[PDB]
Design a protein around this ligand. Structure first.
Ligand SMILES: [Zn+2]
Ligand SMILES: [Zn+2]
Ligand SMILES: [Zn+2]
Lengths: 46, 115, 202, 170, 45, 257, 44, 50, 59, 58, 124, 48, 235, 65
């Protein structure tokens, strides 16, 4: 799921591993997840 | 589009507690006050006053991220004292501190106006 | 090696976060005062530049009268270019080194180079002491015209200014002749940089 | 029966049509042009570049309160990284700042002739000192968050800046 | 008489002002086309 | 274990700005109050703009936006008015907003520019500061600019137009007694107005023990809120926010127990 | 719809599938006055 | 130091003596090596093909 | 290029280096001494085509 | 009024004729090339006035 | 998420504004999301930034921070230690107890150093 | 001596091209002549 | 030379080249020859006198223009080939007198060296103080800068057109900027820039802005995109 | 295009000062002298007036629709 390219800005607060992403880009991107009883409600609400 | 609303800095989000007290298990007699929808204008107000209290061993505040608009305050006191009391008592001093300043300002403002 | 990668990352994060908060108290800046050195060093820099310029003329005079003797491993024309280059190169290093000592501890230029974070001692030298020779294609400025680098310079001129030696620092300001020679040197770097990335990536 | 072949907006930007033009092309068929006008507010993703040096993206936007105010209460409009000046920037930025401070204070447009011996760094510094300012342009900036004076005296001046076409919104 | 050095700085910029006022910034574009449309086109025919 | 007494005195009071000195106060309180003036202070400014006819050279967005930057003389009306969010309205009302109008038309050959004086407001007290004059746009012959606008209370942090402070000059320890800032060459630096020092002395001697005190304030107003009233609202505005924290804080303790 | 000539700046009604030309000028470029549906502008 | 020959001294500590080296343009390693007073061991060229 | 007035002026006075055998044999990218007062030395697009495209000097 | 002009409008697009540098005509040039079978080149492209015939080079 | 053949994985954090945020320690980029759980688990185990490995704005301040001249008051020390994630919670004893407490920069940085690691280096 | 280095040499190392730019050769002398200067000149002549 | 200075049958555009070392005199009249004006120096004395400048100072309403200068012979044009055998002087101060005569025979004098810069380079203050790559870098950035390109933007329709809210002329401006008319139509806004590392949110390639300033119109600009379409009876 | 309402740095009103600024220039007053009369002590505000260009003058030359 290739995303739309966007400029890069620094953020000292974020950890080096962490990366900041806008809401709009994340909205388009999707992550398929297998539902399980332990998280059935989590997928039900989303 | 992606620009956050300007009023979210101070506006309280629906169904979100403004203040949350969390105890710290690293050291006894320590608590974290994760205030939401506030900036450094409020963090430094209480930190300085908390230091003035002799019964406070460690008091400070920090912001995890400026865009988050939430401030975290950590207060540690002596076993007899409690961090919760320190946060409450410090606020009362600030209200009294500003009341004298506000009252005294109104006393001196008229003095300059008349001469 | 001692702890691992997960602990090391926290070391990076703690350094960045803690130092940033402290930086708000100490603060880092930069200004003209850093570039403005004491008058004592300016006289030394100009004196060294003047001495180098006179020495180059003496070398030129020796070659003019055939007094100069070429080294067995080189010819007269190349030997003269080598002797003049060292005099100009040495002046930049000597004047540049004095500039490094000139900067005080409070000076912001010294702080960057001392820590080694950004910049280099050569960059300060070109800002305070002297930019230095502007070599093109590994040599001095070539005679684009008939034996003269630019129309203003006399024919068959091998002096410092004529051949592209820049004796003025960035702060002081370069002469009109030096500006074009500086552009010629910078143009070579841009061309090399443009092709360097293409070749290196390949 | 007809098939729709209308033209939609090229991007998702919100804009207001400015003017509409209806004409006839060279072939004589009806031809029209419309100009869609949109307003772009500078944000963290826009790229700003000085008159010289490398373009710098707006790392973060801070309110006037959070910006470091000086003694006279002048929060800088823009803060750039000092580490750029050494290599990927020029001393002219500092000189231009010094000239801008003198020009604004004295109410005279400074001369930017590349090879004018009249204009010099020392001369500009002397002029600035006459208006109650540091000869090198350094000023004491009070940190917005904590009111204590910053140990290092920041260098502040009215440097000309331009907005590059490269914008995050596009 | 002569231009004193103390006045040459202003004098030198005055002559440059006249050059652009008369010639302009695109004189090289217009002049070549004018020659092409005045003589070259006639010469070809 | 308690706070101090912030004694305050006023140096000079004028329409544009007021200068006062606050003594026996913590640095955090003084610094926080400075930013309280800029952001926390609420003032009334144009926020909602609708154009009925715009034939000026400038565009609709530019003209509509420019009205917001114009300050409004909301001295006591701002206090009685309330934010649109907390009001019981879905549309602006006099109790949670005010009405603004600007109907002009240029028919003379000479260039005519509409300024803030032509900006009519229903509330007599809520009017533009100039009402020389804040020019909005220049109109050509045959150009008209008819539009309706509304103004509402808002925090300074929400938008810059809601900032009545035209630059706050906050100073403390002008002589650098505590060495909070170190000058490489203190002689070169000029002497501040508030400093009390001799010509031959670069800076006051360093005291081993001391705290920031005697903060100098110079609040400059844009004309919307008088500089002698902004401080009164700011101090009350800062503390009323502080009390609100206590009310929520008590609830958290009630939950823990 | 009602259009405006780009030379005389006078109202001229042009229908669908009609030649685009000003009666008073013959000018071949026409503009649209404005829309009656107003929009909301916020000073930001 | 790399060009200079390093020979173990009698005492044991490493010492680098001064030996003349003749860097020559072109590759003639086949014939240059088979020459009088030329080291057949340390004489190496920079051309892998040769 | 109508993005800026300065860009429009530069484009009109823009120059192009020779292409083919003439350009290939020579070094158009490198800055020569003859450009003094005739072609601006500083102005040149950045990239592979660096120095090929230039601008006429003001005078 | 400030627009200097000097371009052509084709199909509504403003086009500027980029000047193309060319070797000067009716001039004798001697160049040294190490790849050619011959040591020196007597290149001289000769053309009449403005242009009566296609340029010829010897 | 994974982006720039060696690629480094990252943990996505949602932020209000549009432009991407990276804790460098400019150029546009496109981040790729591994849909499958198996590769997602593998990426977080070997392709993370910690396993792959400072800005120039921090190194310059670090040299000033560790200078013997730098002395930190109680108030200043509190703020610095708050941002310290790897903090035991106990404030270290001041180097100069009297006449007033004053923590040196190294003392604050001592807690920054993790565990017990010994090394000898020299300044420039 | 001018020895090509950097990208030009790095290319030629991976590019096995038979004819490099400056294919220099280093000659190391041995024995008594390795120390004397004049005694090394005859070797220079017999190689050049 | 006299005929060229007198605007006789030989036009000032024509250039004559004297290859002394080869006994060759080359006269070129064809087009495509790049040349620049140069003040003529005779016997170490400028031909441009005070009276010439006085007339130029009143250039308007006096029927005096640049062409008159060439007519009087004070200034002529030198091409690359003629510049080969023409001596130049940077400024009159260089040729008026020197302790050691670098060159006692000056034929021409440059009006001002700054004219070597182009349209994009001319707008740069202290380019000599600036590094060469930075000056080249600005040339690209200057073109990419957004601002008022022309005055009649509303009437025209362009696919891409960025216009700045408040295009303000710079506080520091070059003399050559007047001729470019960049003062009338600038492409940037001044800013009180404080060079500091604030909160560590700006790296080498980054910058920190003031949110309040942007709310007041610090750098806001408009964007125009033109959509075109025609209904044609192709079939 | 037109003078901004207020200084982008602090927020002091500068649009109203533009009308008086031009009037003072034609009154034989110096460029910097006019700024002092208007009451612009800060250099940030003096920037908004000293080096400002009023482009709307040339735009108004064109006739409207
Ligand atoms: Zn209501
Ligand atoms: Zn008509
Ligand atoms: Zn201001």
């Amino acid at each position: 799921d290739f995303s739309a390219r966007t400029v890069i800005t620094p953020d000292p607060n974020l950890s080096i591993d962490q990366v900041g992403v806008p809401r709009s880009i994340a909205a388009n991107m999707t992550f398929a997840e297998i539902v399980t009883p332990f998280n059935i409600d989590r997928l039900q609400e989303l | 589009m992606n620009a956050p609303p300007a009023f979210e800095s101070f506006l309280l989000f629906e169904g979100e507690k403004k203040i949350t007290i969390n105890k710290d298990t690293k050291v006894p007699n320590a608590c974290l006050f994760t205030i939401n929808k506030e900036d450094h204008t409020l963090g430094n107000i209480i930190k300085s006053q908390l230091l003035k209290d002799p019964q406070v061993l460690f008091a400070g505040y920090k912001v995890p991220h400026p865009l988050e608009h939430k401030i975290i305050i950590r207060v540690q006191t002596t076993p007899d004292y409690s961090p919760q009391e320190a946060f409450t008592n410090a606020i009362t001093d600030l209200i009294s501190e500003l009341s004298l300043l506000e009252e005294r300002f109104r006393v001196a403002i008229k003095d300059k106006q008349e001469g | 090696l001692e702890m691992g990668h997960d602990i090391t990352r926290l070391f990076y994060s703690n350094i960045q976060t803690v130092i940033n908060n402290w930086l708000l108290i100490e603060g880092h800046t930069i200004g003209i005062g850093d570039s403005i050195a004491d008058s004592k060093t300016y006289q030394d820099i100009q004196n060294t530049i003047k001495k180098a310029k006179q020495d180059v003329i003496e070398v030129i005079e020796k070659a003019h009268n055939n007094e100069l003797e070429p080294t067995p491993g080189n010819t007269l024309r190349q030997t003269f270019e080598n002797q003049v280059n060292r005099i100009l190169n040495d002046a930049r290093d000597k004047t540049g080194s004095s500039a490094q000592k000139s900067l005080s501890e409070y000076n912001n230029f010294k702080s960057m180079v001392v820590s080694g974070a950004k910049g280099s001692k050569i960059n300060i030298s070109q800002v305070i002491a002297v930019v230095g020779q502007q070599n093109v294609e590994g040599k001095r400025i070539p005679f684009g015209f008939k034996h003269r680098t630019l129309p203003h310079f006399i024919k068959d001129d091998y002096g410092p200014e004529s051949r592209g030696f820049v004796e003025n620092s960035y702060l002081a300001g370069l002469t009109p002749t030096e500006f074009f020679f500086h552009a010629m040197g910078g143009r070579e770097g841009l061309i090399d940089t443009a092709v360097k990335t293409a070749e290196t990536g390949y | 029966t007809k098939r729709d072949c209308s033209t939609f907006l090229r991007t998702s930007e919100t804009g207001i049509v400015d003017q509409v033009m209806v004409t006839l092309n060279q072939e004589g068929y009806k031809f029209c042009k419309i100009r869609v006008r949109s307003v772009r507010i500078p944000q963290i993703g826009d790229k700003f570049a000085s008159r010289h040096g490398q373009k710098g993206t707006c790392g973060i936007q801070y309110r006037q309160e959070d910006m470091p105010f000086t003694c006279e209460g002048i929060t800088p409009d823009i803060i750039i990284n000092p580490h750029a000046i050494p290599s990927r920037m020029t001393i002219g930025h500092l000189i231009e700042c010094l000239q801008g401070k003198v020009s604004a204070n004295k109410g005279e447009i400074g001369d930017a002739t590349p090879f004018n011996d009249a204009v010099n760094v020392q001369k500009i510094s002397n002029l600035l000192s006459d208006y109650g300012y540091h000869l090198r342009g350094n000023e004491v900036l009070y940190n917005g968050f904590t009111g204590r004076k910053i140990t290092s005296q920041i260098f502040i001046g009215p440097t000309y800046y331009q907005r590059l076409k490269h914008m995050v919104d596009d | 008489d002569e231009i004193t050095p103390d006045l040459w700085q202003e004098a030198c910029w005055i002559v440059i002002s006249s050059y652009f006022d008369e010639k302009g910034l695109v004189r090289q574009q217009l002049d070549s086309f004018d020659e092409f449309i005045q003589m070259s086109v006639q010469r070809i025919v | 274990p308690y706070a101090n007494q912030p004694t305050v005195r006023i140096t000079e009071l004028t329409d544009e700005n007021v200068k006062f000195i606050i003594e026996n106060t913590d640095l955090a309180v003084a610094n926080s109050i400075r930013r309280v003036f800029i952001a926390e202070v609420p003032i009334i400014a144009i926020d909602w703009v609708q154009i009925d006819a715009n034939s000026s050279v400038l565009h609709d967005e530019f003209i509509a936006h420019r009205l917001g930057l114009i300050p409004l003389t909301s001295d006591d009306i701002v206090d009685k008015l309330q934010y649109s969010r907390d009001c019981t309205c879905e549309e602006f009302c006099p109790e949670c907003s005010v009405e603004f109008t600007l109907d002009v038309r240029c028919n003379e050959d000479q260039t005519r520019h509409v300024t803030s004086r032509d900006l009519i407001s229903n509330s007599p007290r809520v009017i533009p500061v100039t009402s020389d004059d804040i020019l909005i746009v220049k109109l050509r012959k045959g150009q008209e600019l008819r539009l309706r606008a509304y103004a509402k209370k808002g925090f300074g942090k929400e938008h810059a137009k809601w900032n009545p402070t035209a630059g706050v000059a906050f100073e403390y320890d002008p002589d650098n007694a505590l060495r909070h800032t170190v000058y490489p060459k203190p002689e070169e630096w000029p002497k501040s107005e508030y400093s009390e020092l001799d010509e031959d002395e670069s800076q006051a001697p360093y005291d081993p023990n001391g705290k920031p005190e005697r903060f100098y304030y110079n609040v400059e107003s844009c004309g919307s809120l008088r500089p002698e009233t902004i401080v009164l609202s700011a101090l009350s505005g800062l503390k009323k926010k502080l009390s609100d924290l206590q009310t929520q804080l008590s609830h958290e303790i009630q939950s823990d127990v | 719809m009602i259009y405006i000539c780009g030379e005389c700046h006078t109202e001229n009604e042009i229908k669908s599938r009609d030649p685009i030309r000003c009666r008073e000028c013959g000018y071949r470029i026409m503009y649209k006055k404005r829309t009656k549906r107003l929009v909301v502008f916020d000073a930001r | 130091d790399n060009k200079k020959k390093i020979i173990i001294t009698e005492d044991g500590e490493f010492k680098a003596l001064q030996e003349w080296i003749l860097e020559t343009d072109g590759v003639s390693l086949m014939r240059v090596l088979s020459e009088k007073d030329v080291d057949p061991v340390r004489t190496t060229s920079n051309d892998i093909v040769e | 290029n109508r993005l800026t007035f300065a860009s429009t002026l530069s484009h009109l006075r823009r120059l192009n280096s020779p292409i083919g055998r003439d350009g290939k044999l020579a070094k158009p990218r490198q800055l020569h001494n003859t450009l003094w007062g005739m072609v601006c030395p500083a102005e040149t697009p950045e990239g592979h085509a660096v120095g090929l495209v230039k601008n006429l000097a003001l005078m | 009024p400030l627009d200097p002009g000097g371009y052509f409008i084709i199909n509504g697009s403003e086009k500027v004729l980029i000047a193309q540098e060319k070797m000067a005509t009716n001039t004798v040039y001697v160049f040294a090339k190490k790849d050619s079978k011959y040591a020196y080149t007597g290149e001289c492209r000769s053309c009449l006035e403005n242009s009566s015939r296609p340029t010829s080079t010897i | 998420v994974i982006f720039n053949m060696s690629m480094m994985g990252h943990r996505v954090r949602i932020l209000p504004w549009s432009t991407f945020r990276l804790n460098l320690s400019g150029d546009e980029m496109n981040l790729h999301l591994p849909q499958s759980l198996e590769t997602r688990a593998e990426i977080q185990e070997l392709a993370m930034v910690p396993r792959m490995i400072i800005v120039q704005d921090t190194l310059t301040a670090v040299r000033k921070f560790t200078k013997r001249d730098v002395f930190l008051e109680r108030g200043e020390v509190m703020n610095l230690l708050m941002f310290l994630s790897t903090w035991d919670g106990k404030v270290p004893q001041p180097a100069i107890l009297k006449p007033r407490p004053l923590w040196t920069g190294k003392q604050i940085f001592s807690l920054i150093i993790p565990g017990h690691i010994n090394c000898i280096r020299t300044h420039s | 001596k001018n020895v090509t280095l950097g990208v030009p040499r790095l290319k030629e190392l991976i590019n096995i091209s038979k004819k490099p730019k400056t294919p220099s050769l280093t000659v190391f002398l041995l024995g008594q002549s390795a120390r004397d200067a004049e005694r090394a000149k005859d070797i220079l002549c017999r190689l050049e | 030379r006299k005929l060229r200075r007198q605007m006789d049958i030989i036009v000032s555009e024509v250039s004559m080249i004297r290859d002394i070392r080869e006994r060759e005199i080359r006269i070129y009249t064809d087009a495509g020859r790049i040349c620049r004006p140069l003040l003529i120096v005779e016997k170490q004395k400028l031909l441009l006198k005070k009276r010439h400048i006085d007339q130029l100072k009143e250039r308007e309403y006096n029927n005096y223009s640049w062409q008159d200068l060439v007519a009087s012979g004070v200034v002529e044009y030198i091409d690359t080939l003629e510049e080969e055998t023409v001596m130049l002087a940077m400024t009159p101060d260089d040729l008026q007198e020197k302790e050691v005569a670098y060159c006692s025979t000056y034929t021409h004098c440059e009006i001002h060296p700054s004219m070597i810069l182009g349209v994009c380079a001319s707008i740069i203050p202290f380019p000599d103080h600036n590094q060469s790559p930075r000056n080249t870098y600005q040339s690209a950035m200057g073109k990419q800068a957004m601002g008022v390109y022309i005055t009649n933007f509303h009437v025209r329709m362009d696919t891409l057109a960025h216009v700045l809210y408040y295009p303000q002329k710079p506080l520091v401006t070059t003399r050559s900027m007047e001729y470019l008319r960049f003062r009338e139509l600038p492409a940037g806004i001044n800013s009180i820039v404080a060079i500091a590392s604030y909160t560590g949110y700006n790296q080498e390639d980054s910058v920190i802005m003031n949110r309040s300033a942007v709310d007041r119109g610090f750098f806001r600009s408009v964007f125009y995109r033109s959509y075109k379409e025609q209904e044609s009876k192709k079939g | 295009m037109i003078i901004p309402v207020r200084c982008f740095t602090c927020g002091k009103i500068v649009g109203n000062k533009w009308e008086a600024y031009l009037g003072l220039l034609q009154a034989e007053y110096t460029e910097g002298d006019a700024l002092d009369a208007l009451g612009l002590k800060r250099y940030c505000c003096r920037r908004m007036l000293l080096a400002h260009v009023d482009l709307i003058e040339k735009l108004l030359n064109y006739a409207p629709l």
